[PDB]
Q: What sequence folds into this?
């Protein structure tokens, strides 16, 4: 969030209206989510034996 | 006659403001314009908060 505000301060000094800055972030947010959604894959095809492995993978990262 | 002071009676209780003269109704206009100054930039979809 602060990174978005740091890049917005540079655009405000250039004379851009703040609403035009917020309108660009809303359109760019949906383009990033739709791009990452196509790259990921579905792990639900695996059985319960492999499904436990994916739970161990994301556990060690949050710890 | 009850004292050498003999105070002068004031029509209104102490603390009351004054009026008439010139600019009394103008004081009410500048009060509404100053409040309007805050609500002007909030007009329009590109307005601020
Ligand atoms: Mg974490």
A:
């Amino acid at each position: 969030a602060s990174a978005l505000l740091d890049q917005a301060l540079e655009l405000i000094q250039k004379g851009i209206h703040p609403i035009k800055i917020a309108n660009g972030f809303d359109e760019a947010a949906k383009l990033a989510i739709s791009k990452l959604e196509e790259t990921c894959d579905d792990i639900s095809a695996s059985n319960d034996e492999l499904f436990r492995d994916f739970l161990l993978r994301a556990a060690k990262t949050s710890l | 006659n009850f004292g050498s002071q003999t105070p002068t009676i004031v029509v209104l209780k102490e603390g009351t403001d004054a009026s008439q003269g010139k600019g009394q109704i103008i004081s009410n206009i500048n009060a509404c314009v100053a409040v309007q100054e805050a609500l002007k930039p909030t007009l329009g979809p590109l307005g601020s908060d």
